[PDB]
Design a protein around this ligand. Structure first.
Ligand code: AS1
Ligand code: AS1
Ligand code: AS1
Ligand code: ARG
Ligand code: FUM
Lengths: 452, 454, 416, 418
């Protein structure tokens, strides 16, 4: 190998994190070979003992890759040959290739990683759930187009960010079932002539089944693309929550005060929401890793091509980011203080209660279009006097619609507004309470589905 | 409203496809408002009748958007008012918004669209399986790094493009569970003061459930983004099959001959016969990867709840669907139409000494340690190569020099037919295993199909 | 050809837009064939007249593609042949391919497009500079992390969105050089044995030069890719302006008040006034990055020379261009029509002790190392920042003026 | 600062490569503070001497960041405050933010980076050019759709990968002009109260001009998005070469044989020589497409001025550059190492009846109309020779192509040196 080629081909700086899985795989692979009659017991136990030794020296950082190691696979054979002979050491590559090996290890790594990610997603859900639970009554101006639209419970807004994250958990569970198929046994592409047992080693390493096609099992990286999708969808959902927090932390909003432990200053007297901003900017990053991996998987002729080595770094970088991001966001969310007096004073500002007036008129029998019309004449009636809709006189109420009567006042508060909306998925506290329970059960239900 | 404003906001050129869905939804919501006491029976049956009338005039092309119309939503209410007057038709607005209306229409539209997409995937899977079945014995050099590695059955190679596409159907089924939550009754964002029933209208419209959070049901577009992923992935899986066909179709390879009906000619070169279907699919895989990235970018950093940005969710998904709707049957037809030159694939199958692995595995069966069987194989390859013969034609002395363990019984494994048959484990290229693999593909497709009908 | 192949191969539905470029190039090719002694004057004039008829009828809506026309090129040959006969109509096709042809028509289209985009980009710059000129001294809280940081002049903030666009305009000038190379006369991929002339036809069709490599000029699509990036970059530049407008317009900020004619409402909440223009701009920049990414994936791993794949060059560039063609004037209209709430901005400018930094920077001018009343006013504070590019009014008026001169200089180079 | 917050905020694992540049600029900033009478000479020399000691300790590597250093900026302040004490090291802080510094530093870093990238591109053109030179007359079947279309010179095909790369070089020059604008002294966002001089420090630091708008200079990241585009276009350009090479190397093609030193093999298949470099080129174009698209997604919808998001500008660009720095010398090498099997290519050149176009083109010169048309030029040598216009595959034409490539390459090389 030339200089340039070694530098390009060298992968130990990112793939070393596969080492432990490579050893566990090799150990179960030893058993398959011995059970097919291709190793003496003693050749078996020699390798078992060389490997346990090598897992030890790896775990504590005593064995590491040399500069002259191309990849995790070559380096652990340096260290295994060091431990048992070259003759015994080399027996271990019978009936497997670097191709089925790498795919499998990458799957075992990633099946753990989604669970680590899953742990973090539940943190943020629990953190949002907690905050919503501690504010069962705080009313804000609910937004569409960032304009005051209707008053809602802070809790209902807040849980609207938990619901997507749970769907992401649902996706992890969906992903992991496709993830749990082992290519160990496929060798380079066609299988082995030797008498191995793909199903046994698949059981050992903890997959659900072995692949039905050796070519497909070594070539396809759709499982990696799907993971990459799922991690991007999580980061994008954090980006939505981050946008909210950032804007909420502004001097102009003043909805939240940031905690010092979860905020940052400047090189003078600023409290910035760095964590939220980094979640946001990183969502862009993890869209890149996904888009780029698909581009890489594109137009790949069967079977394995070296191109496919590029599957890992994108997924690795995606999983790392979320491993930093989720605990931070959960912390940041947990640490938020809400300025409830500030949120409520705004809740009706912009005459958000106009729609309650129009819906009131529908209940008396006015066609929506005309009630909508009447609501607007009243918004102007109120606006021009610096007053709230509730404070319109009976007479000026009577001028807008004869159907408008003093009893409509009894629905022009933000408290009554939020409460009227008690259909499934509405912002009435009774519904938010049930919604909050459902999240509890979905979280737990999903957690258990992952433990299996 | 200014022309500029109005020209940008106008969405009828793409969103007119949701019109049946809109009309159907308004039928269910007519019934919801009635059950809550907010229409007399008169008014109910007047709306029902006017929606029915409007529905037929849309279906056949008498009613269509005008330039005045901002969205299909504006369009249908124009012509509903025309059919039943301004008093009664304007009542339909009660308890709902464009925000919930549109999330639920695009959902409805999409569930059908993956169903159609799924039918097309199933086709391609069907054409791969059929050719696999028709050529159960054809042997080829299997490739890695597009270099000949070990012999494989064409059937085996073919079916490897089926399993990804069955995983994408799986992904479709998974997607649809999440797609089946209705936003109706969420109104602009908070839900409604009126006494509607979201569960009822959810059931009426084919959904499995109503949403648990109005703000979320109206703001979230993760289902759309997911849709785009499944399509993207389906297009990339098609790109893989595409690359192979294109390569196989070269003069150099000569693995397949393209059919006239499934290939295109040149406008200055008389005798060119190109694989354009494969090539367009490869091309459009980039395209559909863009629509997904772009979609997720648009979803990035949305503050809750609805924002006009979310309009941009439909076009990329529509595009990805329309391209798959073209591409799938075309590739199924392409695959089905191919002729395989089995003599060409076979003469190349042992070439570059692909049976080396077989030789070395044979020594491993005699108890020779693999790294040593490797070196002996390598040595056997050169021994034959310089003489320009097959491994089989290594003479007994030649074989004995390479290794004392290597006796002339090795010679009865150095055939492409033996090589291929020896891989009898689950997954392998042996014909008994391909036969089972082909049954599984059959059962899995049926199973996947039946859960899409539910 | 099967039904499915015909449905898949057909591109008339989007490439029709190249029809008039195809005719201008057929005219120029007629001359190239004629000059090389491959046409009589009778034949030449027969073709020129047929091409003129067709062209007049194409612009009329009298002539359009048909269901069984595969592309713009087939469609137009059919119509020339109706007009001038199958014999004389046969001759144009000589020495030329769909490959060199389609690549060249697309370049000519892309070069008019980028100018239309340049016009709209300038308008937004102009809309931005008009508003600056109309608020020359107003002071706002200057933001980073969307947190109040230092006071700045509104004009400074507004022009901070113009420079990005001036730089995008710069990119269009750069692009256009790489763009102005003609593939005409490279045929399929190798050139023609017929005695054509790339240079003459290049010059006839407004290009700076003919291509130096026939294989490369028919295969390469990096010009398309560069266009997608520049348009994607314009959309994101727009999207940063969009985010500021949207937030500015919230009840909570009340920095600006949207104008009735440039905002839309709500079907149920009467009184809404949404910045739909800003919001669509923001959303569409996503779409347009997506167009870029996807175009690059299409180009990736493409063996030479031409592949059917390279038909996907067009539609994404077409969409980007269409979107910017809608977005650009809308956003300029949104920006011209804002009302700025100057007083509400002046209240908040000192809010959060943004003037702390001005105190600490007074400690420095009086000895003490960077630790911690003439400059504890927002007027004094902004006036202190009078180096180049700072917020001082002196510099903003010179900057506002430089913007005017940069804009026109970049305008000059597009007409050339 | 919570553990979580610090974990996330930490930048020293990637932004430490900005340390040399950070130091070079603090030097030029000590001068700016001094010329405005905000430093004494004994102070000014204290710092310069302190910013000298710290530059050497960074260079040989005795000074690096601690676990607690948020970033390269903090780290270098800590090291300076260690060398010249807390009081003096603090003065250097005045009239600058982390905002304008990182903008500037990244640009300095990037201008260096594109120069290194450009050198590798030139290497890859050189390689291609060399192989044309060595195969001046070899004829192969020219392909469109990977179907044999018309015969061309191998030289004509090879060089067709060179023009793209030259155009990418052209984009680098065009890029560099926008890159060469300094934000120094624009501050957090508003410019500085203190009498600094942006134009002078820009010049100290090798920039061409100081920025016209302080909000813009500190918040805009289009320069980074341009760079990412250019890198991703280069990588896509390389993947098109890479695809050719991979397909050529197949047994079926036999167009090229791979070299052992620019080849990799199999742990379980002795005969195997693979095109791993080509294949990693290909795979990594996907990756660099990713970094561009993501970066743009990151820059999308940023309100003015600086936001923490903008920290994400560096890692994807660092990565893209990192990858081309490994892939350019490896590809140039792969290309130079290759054995072209000219006999094999020549056999195939007329295969598929590729000389039919020539047939039709001859009877066109016999007055027959083309569209009906479908031995001097029924040879591949005659066929390629006839295509003698600018751009064609005619021998004397490729030779002129090839000398134009060498000149354009050096012309473009000159402009990077300015
Ligand atoms: N080399 C190879 N696969 C790559 C090993 C794993 C690689 N580092 C990756 O990450 O994809 N494939 C075999 C050779 C082998 O088994 O080592 C081939 O098909 O030639
Ligand atoms: N107008 C609006 N959304 C439009 C939905 C249809 C649009 N084509 C889309 O799909 O985004 N939102 C409401 C107004 C309304 O309820 O009509 C708002 O909150 O202001
Ligand atoms: N399909 C094709 N040429 C380009 C068609 C242009 C296409 N519609 C597009 O828009 O890119 N085939 C050429 C021959 C030709 O038709 O000119 C070939 O096989 O080399
Ligand atoms: N306000 C700030 N914290 N600015 C820090 C600038 C450096 C930051 N790590 C970046 O690269 O963007
Ligand atoms: O620390 C800085 O220089 C900037 C901080 C900020 O803009 O918040």
């Amino acid at each position: 190998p030339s200089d340039a080629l070694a530098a390009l081909s060298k992968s130990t700086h990112f793939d070393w994190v596969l080492a432990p899985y490579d050893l566990t795989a090799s150990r179960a692979h030893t058993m398959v070979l011995f059970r097919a009659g291709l190793l003496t017991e003693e050749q078996r136990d020699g390798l078992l003992a060389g490997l346990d030794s090598l897992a030890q020296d790896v775990a504590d950082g005593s064995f590491g890759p040399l500069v002259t190691d191309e990849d995790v696979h070559a380096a652990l054979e340096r260290g295994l040959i060091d431990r048992v002979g070259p003759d015994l050491g080399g027996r271990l590559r019978a009936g497997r290739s670097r191709n089925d090996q790498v795919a499998a290890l990458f799957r075992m790594w990633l099946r753990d990683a989604v669970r680590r990610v899953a742990t973090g997603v539940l943190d943020v859900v629990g953190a949002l759930a907690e905050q919503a639970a501690a504010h069962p009554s705080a009313i804000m101006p609910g937004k569409t187009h960032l304009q005051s639209a209707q008053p809602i419970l802070l809790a209902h807004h807040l849980l609207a960010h938990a619901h997507p994250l749970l769907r992401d958990l649902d996706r992890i569970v969906d992903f992991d079932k496709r993830a749990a198929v082992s290519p160990y046994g496929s060798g380079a592409l066609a299988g082995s002539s030797l008498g191995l047992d793909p199903d046994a080693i698949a059981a050992d390493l903890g997959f659900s089944a072995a692949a039905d096609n050796s070519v497909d099992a070594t070539a396809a990286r759709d499982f990696a693309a799907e993971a990459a999708f799922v991690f991007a969808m999580i980061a994008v959902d954090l980006s939505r929550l981050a946008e909210d927090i950032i804007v909420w932390s502004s001097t102009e909003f003043g909805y939240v005060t940031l905690h010092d432990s979860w905020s940052t200053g400047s090189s003078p007297q600023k409290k910035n929401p760095d964590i939220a901003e980094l979640a946001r900017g990183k969502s862009g990053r993890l869209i890149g890793n996904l888009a780029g991996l698909l581009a890489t998987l594109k137009a790949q002729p069967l079977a394995y091509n070296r191109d496919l080595q590029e599957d890992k770094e994108p997924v690795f970088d995606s999983v790392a980011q979320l491993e930093l991001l989720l605990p931070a966001m959960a912390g940041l969310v947990a640490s938020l203080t809400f300025n409830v007096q500030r949120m409520a004073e705004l809740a009706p500002a912009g005459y958000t209660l106009a729609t309650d007036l129009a819906e009131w008129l529908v209940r008396q029998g006015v066609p929506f279009r005309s009630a909508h019309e009447a609501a607007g004449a009243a918004v102007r009636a109120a606006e021009q006097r610096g007053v709230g809709l509730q404070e319109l006189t009976d007479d000026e109420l009577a001028a807008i619609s004869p159907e408008l009567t003093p009893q409509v006042r009894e629905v022009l508060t933000i408290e009554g507004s939020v409460s009227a909306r008690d259909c499934r998925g509405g912002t009435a506290p009774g519904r938010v309470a049930e919604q909050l329970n459902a999240i509890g059960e979905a979280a737990e239900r999903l957690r258990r589905q992952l433990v299996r």
